[PDB]
C-alpha cells in the first residue's frame with residue numbers, strides 16, 4: 059500500500075518525487091508522488107508550484123484526499139489566507155491523521171499565528187508540533203523557528219506572557235527573557251544561559267540550543 063507513504067515524513071526533494079512520478083505506471087501511485095512533491099515544494103519556497111501541482115491531480119482515494127486537504131491548508135497559510143487556512147484544518151479529524159500529518163497540521167497553525175503576529179500562539183502550536191516530530195533535523199528546525207518567534211515578540215509580551223501551566227512554554231519564556239535582559243551585557247548573558255540550563259535541564263532547548271544561542275556562546279570577537 060504505497061499510499062501509506064503520505065502518512066510518513068517526506069524528506070526527499072521535489073525533484074526526487076517528480077522523477078519517481080515519471081517512472082510509475084499506476085495512476086494511483088502517480089497521484090501519491092504528485093502529493094509528496096507538492097508537500098516538499100512548499101518546504102523549498104515554491105508555493106505557487108505546489109498549488110499548481112495539486113490542480114493536476116487525478117482521481118484520489120480517501121487517504122490522498124486527506125493529504126491534499128492538509129497541503130491546501132499549508133498553502134493558504136503561506137499565502138496569508140489565514141481564515142481559510144483555519145477553515146481547511148478545522149474540517150480535518152485529528153484522530154484520522156498520522157503523527158507526521160499532525161506535525162504538519164500544527165505547523166500550519168503555527169504559521170497562521172505567526173502571520174497574525176501572535177508569537178505566543180505560534181510557539182504553543184510548535185510545542186504541539188514537536189510532540190509528533192522524530193526527525194532530528196525537523197526537531198532542530200522547529201527549535202530554531204520557535205526561538206525566532208520569541209525573538210520577534212515585543213518585550214511587553216515576553217514580560218507579561220503567561221505560561222498557561224505549560225512547562226515547555228514556561229521554559230521558552232524564561233529563556234527569551236534571559237536573552238532580552240542580558241544581551242547588552244555579554245558576560246552576564248553566558249551566566250544567565252547557564253542558570254537557565256540548570257533550572258530547565260531537560261527542556262527541548264537545553265539539549266539542543268537554538269543556533270543563534272550556540273553562535274553567541276561559541277564566538278569570541
Ligand SMILES: [Cl-]
Nearest residue numbers: 068097098101
Ligand atoms: Cl516537508
